[PDB]
Symmetry: C2
Subunit: 123 residues, 2 copies
């Protein structure tokens, strides 16, 4: 399937891509977006099964991305990643049906468990 990683921080972004690319070992296509605007364009142009996005990104946050996705009912399973332990974000994330809220630094035990649950929810 198609998994879309969104993070304005390139290190964290491309690192999770490599982590997911070797975890998938060719079975899943992993896509990368550097901001929310690009994410929405990939989300409109391609069918994304699992969306993994940061929350705090300039102008368009991950939650803003998810709000525009939830109104359309064909929508990816969403895993949020953030360094911020913010109840408000998590609260909105719940309301919008996010599967997991991973705290940075990313722990790939959690990353992989969440992405498999997201793959399953997509199916």
């Amino acid at each position: 399937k198609t998994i879309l990683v969104v993070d304005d921080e390139p290190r964290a972004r491309e690192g999770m891509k490599r982590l997911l690319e070797k975890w998938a070992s060719g079975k899943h296509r992993i896509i990368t977006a550097a901001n929310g605007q690009e994410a929405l364009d990939i989300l409109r142009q391609e069918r994304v099964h699992v969306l993994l996005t940061d929350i705090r990104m300039p102008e368009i946050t991950g939650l803003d991305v998810l709000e525009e996705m939830r109104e359309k009912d064909d929508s990816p399973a969403v895993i949020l990643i953030s360094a911020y332990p913010d109840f408000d974000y998590a609260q909105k994330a719940i309301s919008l049906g996010v599967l997991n809220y991973l705290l940075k630094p990313v722990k790939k035990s959690e990353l992989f468990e969440a992405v498999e649950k997201a793959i399953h929810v997509s199916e």
Copy 2:
């Protein structure tokens, strides 16, 4: 449908019960429990479509109730309520499939939107 309200404080428990009973108008069945053990017992002995539980309760939290419910073969749709804005509770709730996490003092608007969300999540899974 059967909606189970769980809160260890009686005033809150009866308050949410009374409001939900008014909105139910007999269409839905409102029952209550005072703690997680009470909830677990009800949850094992009858179908509960919607679970509305406080988190901070003595010995067994609302999140602890949910850990037993996802084991059970069919799950209630779950609304969490709490007076405190706790990220750790919220993050666990997310991982546990919670539909909404409302802050006390509960707002009618938020409460009945979450309940209808739950009602349709349960009707979705029949």
